[PDB]
């Protein structure tokens, strides 16, 4: 009923004590599948489950829906996460009332991320600048009804804090009435155990709950670590390097790595483990088997926004909710102050030339599979077709191919060429006309506020990467599909706006980026003939956005 | 249930002209198939059938499963069921057991059938028990259960039964109806004119009970042809002509077939025959489509099965004709077409005759040899000459265009792929060597087993292995052909059974029988897949210089 | 529950003279012990106690368990509970948390206690929080809960909480009572004349609240003596005399003790003190027996005879249980006075040898003075300690001594008793690997070894219980009072390393003595070795011959 009590019992008995965190899926089908997965995984015997809070809102209704479904109908003990600065007092109160009626008695009280547009920062005027304010609020309005957790950071935090100040701030939050701490994910257990010592020496006595993230896939492992700024031991990276492109092998090794880390934590007397499942069952199950703590695999291996959208695990899962990293100042420092289209284009070309690691829409630095199409990509961007994502055609590379290879060995892998880009409304009609004339191309196109255009008649899923491996069915990690694409549309236009808001209200940069997002089309083109490398670039060869140097 | 008798339901269909139809299902070959079938039966019940039929497995191997399903359908899912039941295949205790189960389930409708007599005849219990013909089962049900069960019997518009003699057939049909059958269900047909003429003949013979036409929707071109040819069932040239342009694309075939069958159904309805009985083959889509076309309406992952090569999780899995039975013709007819083999070489020559297109069917053959065997014909022949008796095969294909005249399938502007595979019988003496050779080549997956022994394989996980797939515009990868443990074991049992049923076409002491029985009791069935689909020949290379000894030895 | 206050229950006892008694239980050390305790509490409630007490674990850790048990007892089993609670050991948040839990459980009676102050008073949060004495907790409960809880406080007839100056003690008792306590519960005693004189003193000081005598039935001779000596508690010479003929047979001891304690109780009842509070030590039998003797009544004897940390860990009664407080007794000053100021390993070794030579009565890890069964192995024990293998506990092999043997005998007569030799000691991490290597070479030895913060090493594959003392008696199953078992050993590990640290903290923050003792506890292994061949006396000492800890005279930096 209260987590602090469950934790106290874990600390006394040393019994198997663990919990699972889930996030709100991006698809309706994902939500239904998640409920099934939550039911199955509850038989592993977690003391409770966490449901994350979507930064801002929109999915507020979904989080509350799911807490109600889990707590009230499925009879799963839930801890609801809740942010404050990204919202207002009415939305906070609404969430608390819903959690109350649902039978939830555990809140993880969080700040969330401050708005970039500080002119429109209601929560701070409302007295919700920090997580401590939410802890205080819950205690004042609901007394002892809710047990309250707070976030702890063994390896520091995004905002500009030395460790001493961070622990002072942690003590403030705990002293407002939080019964436990939940840490951000980590893979350096020595640093974690040192941090625990520091926390106790600061006079913070509440139970500490380590955030454990099992390794489902090499990509999500790295991307989530780098995003959370999270040292991976050289021992681990070394052990994974031989098999990084085979996620079955990665997961097998990671099982042992993470389970060993968990044993070091348990032997240190920290007895409750909090698993970030990423809405997947297998990696968590595997770690629990390794710990001897135990009493449907079709979406085992997600691929960011390119996997099956029916999976609970679908989407780019680097952070707790939508947006760019870094201070407004830092983002102006990395991406400059663009006054026109050409400036944006040059930024993107810098990305393609490996001079910048991250664009606003970039999960990661430019991949090696761009090397042989780099000039064509650069050419598009010069002409103002701002490329967001791409892949080359591949016609049966060996699965150990250093650039193109993935999965187990003695396989062959295939890729349909695709291209995804922003383009001006002036130029879109022509692009449409040209694609429609070539019937072996599938396209999806949409504006921020408009309707989806496509030539796909059925518009079911289209496989654009697949693999043939001994003794196996065809593996299809990369899909282009209507629902996946619309899910991305919303995020992409949002990221553009969050970029715009790194600049001042009247600024050239802001008005430029906002006009772009409100008028430009996001376009995805797939060439279903995977024998052909260049036909997408050929189709787009004459086309240029005019007024590349125009300043608003 | 509720004392509902089909004869009354049919009388009402004939009076009202209301939408009146029923769906036949068969017992699936896999446990997963069974579960999936229950879901499908639930979904399809919303189309509004008056009832559903569940078929009886020839012999009563799957008798427990049929009964399980009738109970599940009638008693738990609340679906009005007619249970099929055979008699000559079984004996009195098994018949009574099935009837008692159908009784307790709340079933009130039986389709009373003979099934196929045993080939041996020395071991024919049912005839000893007085169950030689379906009429005997009709009489039995009436004696033991009175009016509780309404009883259907089989009718044959295009001859069938055991002999097409004609007229004698209608006399025999009248005998069975007069034993106390309330209705007739016909075997499938596609010649509606012949059907309507047959109906006239049936009535003129003084048989007045309601006639229910067996309608088979076209799910796939292959199953359409194979089931028609097996049932000896005239397909109009009109139909064959209209399907030929698109025979290798089953989406297109099914679209055309919707119209063909719906048109046929309209001709039947206009003739005053008002209840349609659909053979679903445990698939929903083709039946749904025909009903949409008639305006009779109020999980497509397995829409396109591929005999024993499709997904074994599908209800529709398996090679689906003649109710699970075995081999088709008279013992005489089978001796006439397959000869009287005295040794291994005789069998080999029979198989080579098959490969050379000189005979259309082997005991293990769904169909005549495909064109995709033409470019590997010599190697197949070579194996059979050396006594590696090939049952099934396919060549490697590395991205043929989907319109390729031999290799192509599915829609256009696609590419299709095949892993080479080989399936064959081999002597126990030679199997150890074959095993040793396969194990040395790690890119080969193999499955091997005897009639009575355990499955050997190098597949560690032994999940499904895709051996035919296709890449089509705007689609996920299509995988019609799978080699999988469950599929293979399902086949093992059937293959060794077919061999024994072949043996029993010959006399008890005969050279042919003792030969075939020794072979089935000792030889291994082996399936080898070359996962490198860039390579055509490595399977044949691996098996070069292996020969079964004593090819001419007569037992 | 039901607003029932103990002061009213006591007033009724005093008016009616009805059978009025209560049972104290403590939080068990084992999960299995907890479950067994619930069963015992259920059974014993049929004896008809007015309520039960649940003790508070000094410091915490088991705070959760105390609260769990109060909830289980009060809320689910329907047993009227009085929850004990300390304050100086804790802080304001933990106190409030405990009170809130007792509140929600339906408890309406608290025994308000100080507990023991930290030895390192630099780290004393509770005193900054305004919780220096029990009176502060009494005041706090009254302020936060008003009349909801009736509050008891501790009384000391024989002068044993911190100081013994009886005048000052009674002044302080009056302060506590006047803060809003409704009753007094005394520490255990066996001198009834002193008790009745004390009551007179209490009343003459102007303290009128009901007094509840703490009665401890005699379960075993060992626990009787150890608890008495530890609480500094005069046992009458009449009692010692009457027990001496049969001290090694606990059945006989318990039979005699039934009469002794029941007679004492009758003297108390005739004096007009009508409610008896029994310290059960989580055992049923001795309390039952006293109640039968008083005519106050209206297998599960498998653990009737515990043996400190050596008995079955599944018993509720398992563990040492000399005090409430999981630490060493006495002022920091007093402890420095008796154990000196050790600067190096040799100093500690000499302290231990002084213990072995009967020159000091108590080491930090010592329940009692050295036993007579050490006499014939004393030189070998001394030899180990000289070499820096600091021995904590030991026993000789015994191969079927008669049960009346003056040194080795125990239990009833015409029996035979057996002991596996065992040795338990602290050893440096430098030397442990060698000891391990040597034990592993001798397969008839079972060992358990562990550090303060490290994992358990052992050669026991199943690692179930190993019997190291047993007895064969006429008409009986084999009696197995002494067991070495994983759970028992880990329970002890934690306590042993804690006692070492509590010793360290008797010295100043920077001091040689403290840094020495802390380094030792944080780095040295606790090792238990059993020689399963009980025909062999000396093979443990042989195995460990020529091992020596280096830097015995080195003084830390
Ligand atoms: C286990 C866990 C779960 C999470 N779940 C979610 C989730 O569901 N949804 C989501 O959007 N995010 C989530 N987050 C992310 C979190 O919202 C971000 O890290 C966010 O930036 C703030 O974290 P916080 O609540 O710890 O903020 P705070 O504890 O307020 O700290 C925020 C910053 O302000 C500083 N600070 C604190 N007090 C003061 C003060 N008095 N004066 C000045 N500066 C101060 C801190 O040092 C720090 O730099 C989660 C994080 C963790 C570790
Ligand atoms: C709608 C339908 C459903 C079927 N369902 C199944 C099923 O679920 N399971 C299964 O195993 N099979 C099934 N069958 C197949 C059937 O069992 C075979 O066709 C079988 O070989 C004949 O069975 P019958 O009941 O039609 O035979 P019968 O009507 O007994 O005819 C059998 C043969 O004996 C002849 N004959 C009949 N009476 C006499 C007589 N008095 N004297 C001499 N000769 C006689 C007939 O002319 C014919 O040649 C079904 C057939 C149909 C049409
Ligand atoms: C019946 C009983 C039950 C107990 N139960 C438990 C239990 O469950 N758990 C546990 O940990 N311990 C328990 N104890 C032990 C108790 O916690 C210790 O004996 C403790 O050291 C003193 O407890 P107290 O409440 O009497 O302290 P207090 O009455 O506060 O006094 C303790 C010492 O401080 C002195 N003192 C008091 N007031 C002042 C003042 N104003 N100025 C100066 N000195 C002062 C006293 O004279 C005495 O020397 C129990 C004791 C008894 C008698
Ligand atoms: C497409 S590969 C990336 C390889 C390379 N960067 C390229 O050129 O595409 C990444 C995807 O493959 C998936 N994957 C890797 N190994 C797999 C395996 N054994 N089975 C299934 N999916 C696998 C991952 O989970 C991820 O979704
Ligand atoms: C996650 S991978 C997609 C590959 C695909 N999922 C697969 O299975 O191979 C992202 C790809 O887009 C490319 N990319 C990233 N940012 C880009 C940009 N701004 N413009 C064009 N291509 C970009 C990367 O170099 C990489 O090839
Ligand atoms: C593998 S192809 C035939 C191979 C080879 N050309 C031959 O005929 O010997 C036949 C299989 O493909 C399936 N099939 C045909 N068209 C299809 C389509 N459009 N979508 C999915 N499966 C299809 C059929 O149902 C059957 O399972
Ligand atoms: C139903 S198809 C199976 C292949 C599958 N439909 C596909 O995806 O191509 C049967 C195949 O086995 C071959 N075959 C049939 N009988 C054979 C035999 N006795 N020996 C060897 N090959 C045989 C046919 O020529 C054909 O290629
Ligand atoms: C708890 S008593 C008795 C243990 C056990 N119940 C028995 O039957 O002997 C512990 C035993 O170890 C001895 N002992 C106590 N402290 C010791 C120490 N520091 N070093 C060695 N032996 C010690 C005692 O003299 C006694 O023989
Ligand atoms: C291990 S023996 C040692 C006694 C004494 N040091 C001696 O040997 O002279 C003491 C323990 O034996 C057990 N004990 C004594 N008498 C017993 C009896 N009659 N039945 C069962 N256990 C008994 C109790 O658990 C007691 O703590
Ligand atoms: Na904990």
Numbering used by the authors:
A (entry chain A): 1 to 295, 337 to 593
B (entry chain B): -2 to 295, 337 to 593
C (entry chain D): -2 to 295, 336 to 594
From the paper:
Additionally, by introducing a human patient mutation, Arg357Cys (Arg315 in cMTHFR), we successfully crystallized cMTHFR in its inhibited, T-state, AdoMet-bound conformation. The analogous Arg315Ala mutant was used for structural studies to avoid the possibility of inter-disulfide bonds introduced by a Cys mutation. cMTHFRR315A displays the same FAD absorbance quench and red-shift at 450 nm displayed by R315C. The cMTHFRR315A mutant was successfully crystallized, and its structure solved to 2.8 Å. In this inactive T-state, the si-face of FAD is occluded by Tyr361 on the C-terminal region of the linker, which forms a π-stacking interaction. Additionally, each monomer adopts a more compact structure relative to the R-state, where the catalytic domain is rotated by 45° coupled to a translation of ~16 Å, burying the catalytic domain between the linker and the regulatory domain. The regulatory domain was found to bind AdoMet, as expected for the T-state. Unexpectedly, two molecules of AdoMet were found per regulatory domain. The combined effect of these changes explains the catalytically inhibited nature of the T-state, where the Tyr361 and the C-terminal linker (Tyr finger) act as an autoinhibitory element, a form of intrasteric (active site-directed) regulation.
Methylenetetrahydrofolate reductase (MTHFR) is a pivotal flavoprotein connecting the folate and methionine methyl cycles, catalyzing the conversion of methylenetetrahydrofolate to methyltetrahydrofolate. Here, we report crystal structures of Chaetomium thermophilum MTHFR (cMTHFR) in both active (R) and inhibited (T) states.
